Amino acid sequence: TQSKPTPVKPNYALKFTLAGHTKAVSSVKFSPNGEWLASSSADKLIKIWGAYDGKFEKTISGHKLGISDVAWSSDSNLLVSASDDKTLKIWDVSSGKCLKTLKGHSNYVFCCNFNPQSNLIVSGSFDESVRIWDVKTGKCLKTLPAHSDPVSAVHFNRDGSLIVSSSYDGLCRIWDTASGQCLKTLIDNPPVSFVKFSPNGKYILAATLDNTLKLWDYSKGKCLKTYTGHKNEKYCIFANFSVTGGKWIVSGSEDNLVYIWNLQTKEIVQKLQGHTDVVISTACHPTENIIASAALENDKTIKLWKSDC
Numbered sequence: 001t002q003s004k005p006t007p008v009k010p011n012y013a014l015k016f017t018l019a020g021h022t023k024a025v026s027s028v029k030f031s032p033n034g035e036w037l038a039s040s041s042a043d044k045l046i047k048i049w050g051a052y053d054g055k056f057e058k059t060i061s062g063h064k065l066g067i068s069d070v071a072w073s074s075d076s077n078l079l080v081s082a083s084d085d086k087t088l089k090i091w092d093v094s095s096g097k098c099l100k101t102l103k104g105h106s107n108y109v110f111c112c113n114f115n116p117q118s119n120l121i122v123s124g125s126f127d128e129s130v131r132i133w134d135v136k137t138g139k140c141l142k143t144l145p146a147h148s149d150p151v152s153a154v155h156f157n158r159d160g161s162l163i164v165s166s167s168y169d170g171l172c173r174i175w176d177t178a179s180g181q182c183l184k185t186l187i188d189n190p191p192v193s194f195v196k197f198s199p200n201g202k203y204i205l206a207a208t209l210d211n212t213l214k215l216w217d218y219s220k221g222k223c224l225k226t227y228t229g230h231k232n233e234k235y236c237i238f239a240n241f242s243v244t245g246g247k248w249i250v251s252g253s254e255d256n257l258v259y260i261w262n263l264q265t266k267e268i269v270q271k272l273q274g275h276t277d278v279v280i281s282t283a284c285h286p287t288e289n290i291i292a293s294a295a296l297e298n299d300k301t302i303k304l305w306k307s308d309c
């Protein structure tokens with residue numbers, strides 16, 4: 001007799017605190033194979049940690065100014081980083097060495113992602129452009145005049161045919177990867193600080209700097225769900241879909257907590273306490289009920305939390 005579990009709430013509990021960065025942490029990401037956690041920081045460094053035990057593995061260095069974002073390739077062998085030095089760098093994680101420096105942006109690079117094939121990288125910058133890069137050659141393939149204010153997030157869908165971008169200009173835009181042309185603009189116009197596609201490819205999850213997260217059917221232009229109760233008026237704070245156990249939405253917050261909501265009811269189901277500064281970034285492990293969170297410069301640590309569901 002087979003049943004479907006429906007947990008009312010998770011029970012994430014602190015397991016490890018990861019110290020080592022000397023300035024604000026800016027992003028954390030789990031490797032797709034689930035073995036590693038990468039972190040980036042205003043201290044110009046990337047650090048690699050064991051995903052299950054938080055054990056320090058290595059520091060990856062080379063950027064000349066702070067880093068805002070890091071992202072993994074699909075095979076977990078490469079990382080790309082986005083820096084205030086106006087470059088992105090592609091790293092071989094095993095060797096810890098820089099393979100390519102992606103030059104073209106004219107101001108801080110704020111956000112980056114590989115496509116699932118991992119032959120392309122997308123970036124967004126304070127220069128208000130989105131760029132599409134060839135991983136092999138390290139050269140820019142396309143520059144999209146995407147926005148009229150800094151670009152806060154860029155994300156590919158699962159076949160890599162679409163990019164979604166967000167900006168402080170208050171817009172979310174859907175771009176056709178192959179041509180670079182805009183497919184859709186979603187629009188008051190509060191600054192959009194984060195966006196990504198949902199697991200089923202149908203929605204975008206968008207954060208705005210009015211303490212609001214919204215799940216949009218982008219083809220219809222209809223808001224399906226809204227998540228509130230956290231604090232987000234200043235920083236570009238990632239949000240996540242938790243796909244391993246219960247259906248949750250996860251976000252950091254400017255009141256130093258991690259917020260977790262019920263996807264469908266929109267109720268807060270847990271708040272995780274421990275950090276002593278803004279939780280700027282959270283990540284959800286790809287197969288286990290594990291959350292990584294990271295905080296700004298009064299804290300500078302990463303925390304690993306684990307749930308039974």
Ligand SMILES: COc1ccc(Br)cc1S(=O)(=O)Nc1cc(-c2ccccc2)ccc1O
Binds near residue numbers: 199202225241247249
């Ligand atoms: C596999 O998809 C996942 C997995 C984990 C997460 Br958390 C989210 C998704 S989803 O949003 O992409 N699909 C998805 C939507 C809903 C839903 C229902 C009503 C209104 C709006 C959304 C329910 C279940 C769902 O599975």
